[PDB]
Amino acid sequence: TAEKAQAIAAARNTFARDNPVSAGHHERARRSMPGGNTRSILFHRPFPLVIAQGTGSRFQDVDGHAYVNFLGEYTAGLFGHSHPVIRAAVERALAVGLNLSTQTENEALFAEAVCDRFPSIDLVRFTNSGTEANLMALATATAITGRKTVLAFDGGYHGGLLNFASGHAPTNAPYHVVLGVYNDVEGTADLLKRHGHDCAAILVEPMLGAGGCVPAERAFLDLLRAEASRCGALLIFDEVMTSRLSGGGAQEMLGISADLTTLGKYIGGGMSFGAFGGRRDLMERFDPARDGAFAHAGTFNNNILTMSAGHAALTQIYTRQAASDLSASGDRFRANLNRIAVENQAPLQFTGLGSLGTIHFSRAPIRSAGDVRAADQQLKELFFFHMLRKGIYLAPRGMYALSLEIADAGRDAFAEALADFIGEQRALLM
């Protein structure tokens, strides 16, 4: 509607008036990077906030405004901006030496911690991102099976070269990808009958992350596990986001085992990180001593900062117990946010699991990419600008990912700001 469009025009202008120093930064950034941007998700209109500095769960922008960071680096930033244990791991790495050009002890210790944590990961390899992890998992599936077809899901996001958030992106690596509808048992069974013979892999998030914190239904994942086994395709669970949900990620909570699992985000302690692991027999194809071994180099794969900060992250900070506690805290938080919507007759909900959640302006079921897209997009943008005015930073698309540094005062301020949105924007919520 026109009414909402005008509300957004007003909110954008208010943001621009609040943030003229960020505005100047944007005009300069446009000289060296396309649209002043090097990570597409950071861009929003009229321009993005530039931040100056942060400590713990808080940061300040270049205009001086302070915020609680509920975004947490799209789930990588589990430790806040200045964790002393992470800092210590960085100091220990610098003492060991940088760019050591050789095999290290720390990479093996980190690997042991990873294999110990995740119940379907017998052996693991590190990459430099979730994008690389997923690409290597597809390389594995395709090379082993000799097949070309990959089943993935509309709304699915698996990195820079495997972006299905708005269907097929023209920039995707040219794997022969067939897209199903997330959570659609009937349609997906049909696609598997059609393509099962030629399917190298099923690639799926146990909860759409970038696609809107949409949990996978049990019946959907059971279909995928059964059919992958029947047709000889590798089931790949992309847990780059979902691994945080318990000590052993979504697979532990589900009792469903993927053939390969990809990891990313928080696991390297906030340093560059990705990983792919899985069944021993599949991963041994990368043993470089073995006959016709697959090649997987990568300059920074075993870099000392990631290996050292990650080992600290898993063993000292985000233990199995910390994962259970944060996820339970996240469940209570999301229920409280939904109670606020319910008690105020608000046409919104928050979907997700554990410490992950996203607002959707609909009271209908949010089960697939279609549902997320059909929910009100103008109200979502308005909500972002409102939260900023309340000193709460979350994703433009309405996602939060609670760090370990988020405390009672932070959660309370978020919940109060949500109530304020509902009251202040009542006219637009009818």
Ligand X SMILES: Cc1ncc(COP(=O)(O)O)c(CNOCC(=O)O)c1O
- Residue 241, contacted partner among its own copies, ligand X, none, CB below 5-8 A by kind: ligand X
- Residue 238, contacted partner among its own copies, ligand X, none, CB below 5-8 A by kind: ligand X
Contact between 153 and ligand X per CB under 6 A: no
Contacts 24+ apart (CB under 8 A), 104-113: 104/302, 104/304, 104/307, 106/304, 106/307, 106/308, 106/311, 107/302, 107/307, 109/307, 109/311, 110/306, 110/307, 110/308, 110/310, 110/311, 110/314, 113/310, 113/311, 113/314, 113/315
x/- string (CB under 6 A) for ligand X, residues 248-287? ----------------x---------x-------------
- Residue 209, contacted partner among its own copies, ligand X, none, CB below 5-8 A by kind: ligand X
- Residue 205, contacted partner among ligand X, its own copies, none, CB below 5-8 A by kind: ligand X
- Residue 49, contacted partner among ligand X, its own copies, none, CB below 5-8 A by kind: its own copies
Angle at 155 between CA 361 and CA 184, to 5 degrees: 90
Binding span for ligand X by CB under 6 A among 87-95, 147-155, 294-302, 420-428? 294-302
Q: How far apart are CA 43 and CA 2, in angstroms?
A: 24
Cα 225 to Cα 136, 185, 271: the distances in Å are 20, 12, 32
298 is in an annotated binding site: yes
Closer residue to ligand X, CB minimum distance, 153 or 421:
153
DSSP 125-147: EEESSHHHHHHHHHHHHHHHH--
> Nearest approach, Cβ of 288 to its own copies (angstroms)?
4
Size, binding site for ligand X by CB under 6 A: 23
Contact between 176 and its own copies per CB under 8 A: yes
Q: How far apart are CA 292 and CA 90, in angstroms?
A: 37
With beta carbons less than 8 A apart as the criterion, state whether 380 and 45 touch.
no
Q: Which residues contact 180 (CB under 8 A, 6 or more apart)?
A: 151, 152, 153, 154, 187, 188, 191
> Nearest approach, Cβ of 373 to its own copies (angstroms)?
16
Q: How far apart are CA 117 and CA 246, in angstroms?
A: 9
Closer residue to its own copies, CB minimum distance, 298 or 347:
298
With beta carbons less than 8 A apart as the criterion, state whether 425 and 99 touch.
no
Q: How far apart are CA 390 and CA 417, in angstroms?
A: 6
Binding span for its own copies by CB under 8 A among 56-64, 223-231, 372-380, 406-414? 56-64
Binding span for its own copies by CB under 8 A among 83-91, 231-239, 245-253, 363-371? 83-91
265 is in an annotated binding site: yes
- Backbone φ and ψ of 50, nearest 5°: -100, 130
Residue bearing tokens 């041994």: 284
> Nearest approach, Cβ of 41 to its own copies (angstroms)?
4
DSSP 336-389: HHHHHHHHTT-S-EEEEETTEEEEES-SS---SHHHHHHS-HHHHHHHHHHHHH
> Nearest approach, Cβ of 357 to its own copies (angstroms)?
16
Among 70, 74, 118, 361, binds ligand X (CB under 6 A): 74
Name which of residues 335 to 394 contact its own copies (CB under 8 A): 393
Residue bearing tokens 């699992």: 261
- Which uninterrupted H or E stretch holds 68? strand 66-69
> Nearest approach, Cβ of 241 to its own copies (angstroms)?
10
Name which of residues 366 to 425 contact ligand X (CB under 6 A): none
Q: Answer whether the bond into residue 174 is a cis peptide, omega within 30°.
A: no
Binding span for ligand X by CB under 6 A among 28-36, 154-162, 318-326, 331-339? 154-162
With beta carbons less than 8 A apart as the criterion, state whether 424 and 348 touch.
no
Contact between 48 and ligand X per CB under 6 A: no
DSSP 317-338: IS-HHHHHHHHHHHHHHHHHHH
39 is in an annotated binding site: yes
Contact between 209 and ligand X per CB under 6 A: yes
x/- string (CB under 6 A) for ligand X, residues 112-131? -----------------xxx
Name which of residues 321 to 350 contact ligand X (CB under 6 A): none
Size, binding site for its own copies by CB under 8 A: 120
130 is in an annotated binding site: yes
Annotated binding site for pyridoxal 5'-phosphate: 130-131, 299
Residues that bind ligand X (CB under 6 A): 39, 41, 74, 129-131, 134, 157-160, 205, 209-210, 238, 240-241, 264, 274, 297-300
